[PDB]
């Protein structure tokens, strides 16, 4: 892992970037009512690439 490949580092990077909650303004714009990303992951429970 410390000796990561570039391809692997870039796929893992997107997961950190997309691990974000719905922006509060987007909930107001879309009148979403349900307020949770669901695609969000936690390092201990998630098994990315498994």
């Amino acid at each position: 892992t410390a000796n990561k490949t570039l391809s692997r580092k870039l796929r893992l990077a997107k997961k950190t970037k997309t691990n974000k909650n719905i922006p509060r303004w987007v909930i107001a714009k879309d009148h979403l009512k349900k307020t949770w990303n669901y695609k969000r992951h936690h390092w201990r429970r998630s098994h990315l690439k498994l």
């Binding site: 570039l6 580092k9 990077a13 997107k14 950190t16 970037k17």
Partner: protein, 69 residues
């Protein structure tokens, strides 16, 4: 800011497909400055962070002030 003042180094996010020779030439052409060294890392978020150390004669504080840093 401490890096720009003491180590004369401007840190700049660059394209990841770019290379240290290309970053040095590009910074020199756009900012009209001389660059002694470039050191670069690809951030955990995928972006490429390039530490451009300006030549000792050039002062990075002046170049940063023109940039808006």
């Amino acid at each position: 800011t401490t890096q720009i003042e003491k180590n004369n180094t401007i840190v700049f996010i660059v394209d990841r497909r770019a290379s240290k020779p290309e970053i040095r030439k590009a910074f020199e052409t756009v900012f009209e400055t001389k660059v002694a060294r470039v050191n670069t890392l690809i951030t955990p978020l995928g972006l490429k962070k390039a530490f451009i150390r300006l030549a000792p004669d050039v002062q990075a504080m002046d170049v940063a002030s023109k940039m808006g840093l």
